[PDB]
Symmetry: D2
Subunit: 199 residues, 4 copies
């Protein structure tokens, strides 16, 4: 059982003019493809170390497993969080939960925008669901550290603030990239993930 | 006494075709200018906290002080480490030290290249001088963490592997950026820093 | 500003038999005294570095500032959170808040106990108040990293799980130390800190 | 692979009066036993996660794997580095190497002592061999982070500065524990590890 690079659920230029085709093609066919391959390489090395009981090799492989493994997790969710049919505001119970936990939808965007723009270096901004507390929660993750594996929160919406995700189009003005991405957020997908957390 | 953005010792397009003018202009006039301003803002906030004895505010300001403060340190050295008159190999005692500590100049480039390309996320690759041991030493730093402040090593040559330092020209192929930058390394400046470490 | 070691609100043997007198004496007159002394020395160096604009020295002093500065913050709160007249359960809105956010007082004890016992190495277990969300929140901190300075949460009740806090009496059985400390929790002080969080 | 708690090469009271019998008994039968048991449980979970491709579970298990896995590595080496027939100074090439890399045996003790006493919180002080550079090197590790797995250096002599390693006897005065441990250093074992580093 090996991990595979999931196909993009839309054309490279489907999110224009918010995210140009050059960024989408590089972000998926180059960056994500490398994470999957490196992930499969690390898993095979880790399996050999675990069979031999080489705990030293297991720990030496952790940085490569979390970075590439997290990259495969984060980017796989990122594509579904975007869509040419996205934008606007969510509906149903998710919208009610955003108003209840953050006050309003605009306030929520402000909190997630501040968490995303506040990331110093490479990282991610996430809207997650706290299963224990039963409400929403915003958190930032450094580098490719996945949300659930490092915080326990269930990812609902992630914003890649790696420079490779916007620099070609927005250069150093990360806020401009954060303002535009809200227009293509696939709230239908984010709603499916939210409803799955409640039973 | 406030920190200031040092002027670039050459034209934006002096390092072409290795580093295009668009990268140099953005890297200096936008990224570095922000580090200096944010650094001065943080120092003033830290001074107020220190006068009031507010240790909580001091610690809350550490991430902003190390990132912007380190950025001002790293980029100020980075410009002098490059030059249109650079490239080739160093001479004198520095070349002898590289051969003695790393075997050869090509081996040194291999070690610093591996440290630079091995940085997962944002960071820096550095050639430093270990004053205690009296020899050279290669080390990688995450994000803008400066070399001397976090390792004690005296910086001699730094390679910015932040994506903003090469993505516009080399995209995700960081190795291509590392291969080209060796042609514009200002070994005259790196020699001055090395000779200053010995007395 | 010259920080000072606060006088203990009680004699070293007031919390027996839950925390013996030898631990209290060492924890206050040796461990806490060292943080204050080292903190004052570090603050003086930070003042000298700021006057000279030595950013390298500032970053090099951060670990000592956070450890000793956080130690002064944490232990100063720890003494007030304990009392010979403590124990039992809180009353009023704090008890209602514990029931609301954690289900019941017993469930809250189980969650904070797991967080304190879960600390690998040295650290602290904290019950804090999230002013932005307006409810309670449990969090663990590594080493002496203070709660508010590193997380923003306002400390209400802290449990020192440094080995020096229980080893002399409970040895490696940290769970026994967690069970015994509930008998001396000064809920009057925790309520004061909880009321200070509200308008 | 089912890791096992290694038998001690001596009785618990063989290293008296430098390390009393109560510490040795607790450190081996309680502290080290917990790392092995928790390590075996964590490895089993890692095998289950790998078979299912659950990368989230793999990353969530890393802290427990590094702490307990590193604990098994460090303590297993620590017992062999000590002996009732130890003490004094090394001989042969190891002594020459200590003189070459650190000037003298006394200066080496001062450097490794400062590194061990300098650990803030829990950690380890290590004398290691850098195979790439072919000389000795001193390094400190936080918590149970093993030397080779996190730094690449081959461990030669380790000093446990976890509070549980000395507090019962020396209380908060860690320097006294560092001075006393030199009397039981098994330089015969350290030489074997140093000779294994060379062809
Ligand atoms: Mn990305
Ligand atoms: Mn840069
Ligand atoms: Mn303490
Ligand atoms: Mn130990």
């Amino acid at each position: 059982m090996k991990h595979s690079l999931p196909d993009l659920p839309y054309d490279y230029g489907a999110l224009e003019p918010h995210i140009n085709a050059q960024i989408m093609q590089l972000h998926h066919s180059k960056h994500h493809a490398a994470y999957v391959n490196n992930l499969n390489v690390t898993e095979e090395k880790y399996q050999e170390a675990l069979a031999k009981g080489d705990v030293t090799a297991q720990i030496a492989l952790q940085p490569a497993l979390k970075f590439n493994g997290g990259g495969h997790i984060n980017h796989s969710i990122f594509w579904t969080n975007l869509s040419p049919n996205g934008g606007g505001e969510p509906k149903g119970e998710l919208l009610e939960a955003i108003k209840r936990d953050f006050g309003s939808f605009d306030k929520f965007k402000e909190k997630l925008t501040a968490a995303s723009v506040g990331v110093q270096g490479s990282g991610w901004g996430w809207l997650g669901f706290n299963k224990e507390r039963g409400h929403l929660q915003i958190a930032a993750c450094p580098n490719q550290d996945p949300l659930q594996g490092t915080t326990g929160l269930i990812p609902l919406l992630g914003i890649d603030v790696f420079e490779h995700a916007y620099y070609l189009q927005y250069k150093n003005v990360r806020p401009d990239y954060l303002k535009a991405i809200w227009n293509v957020i696939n709230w239908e997908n984010v709603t499916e993930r939210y409803m799955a957390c409640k039973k």
